[PDB]
Amino acid sequence: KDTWGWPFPSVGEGYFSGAQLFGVNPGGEFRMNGFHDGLDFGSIDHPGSAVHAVHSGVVTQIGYIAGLENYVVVRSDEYTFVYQEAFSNKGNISVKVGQQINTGDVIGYRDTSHLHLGITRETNVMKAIANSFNNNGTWLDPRALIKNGIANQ
Ligand SMILES: [Zn+2]
């Protein structure tokens, strides 16, 4: 019941650079509006191969949009989770649309320099993605969410 976990559980929370953190941070000025709509887990700072689901849900979408590259969308009762940029091709994704997943289940295998994790209450993922650079409450801080979720389970 509402379990949470980190995507690379041997590292757990670990540490993030200014650029990797959610929101508007020193080091993130290179992005539009200086806003980062997710949390980046680098292969250096958060080592590991298998990307573990941070929360239970159902896989609603697997697609490709340059920038997100290959991505997986998982929807729970309250949240939409986007796992993006980790997978150099769709063959690196382990799950299929319609699949019920539990916290810790492998989404796929990261073979790029990072996973970007995005979390939103928005149900229309494309609309949320249209707000990738807008600090308007669409996207939530995954670090704070996972941390609080783990503490409260
Ligand atoms: Zn990112």
Author numbering: 360 to 512
Q: What did the article's authors report about this structure?
A:
The structure comprises residues 360–512, and residues 338–359 were not visible in the electron density map. The core antiparallel β-sheet anchors the catalytic residues, which bind a central Zn2+. Zn2+ is coordinated by three adjacent residues (His395, Asp399 of the characteristic HxxxD motif and His475 of the HxH motif) and three water molecules (W110, W111 and W119) in a nearly perfect octa-hedral arrangement. Glu444 and His473 interact with the metal ion through the W111 water molecule. CbpA contains a longer L-shaped Loop 1 above the Zn2+, thus forming a lid above the active site that regulates the entrance of the substrate towards the middle of the groove. It differs most in the loop 4 of CbpA, forming an α-helix rather than a coil that is present in lysostaphin. These different conformations of the loops in CbpA may indicate binding to more diverse substrates compared with lysostaphin.
In the present study, we identified and isolated choline-binding protein A (CbpA) as an S-layer protein of L. salivarius REN that we show is important for adhesion. The adhesion values of ΔcbpA and Δnam-amidase mutants to HT-29 cells were reduced by 62% and 16%, respectively, compared with wild-type (WT), indicating that CbpA represents the major surface adherence factor of L. salivarius REN.
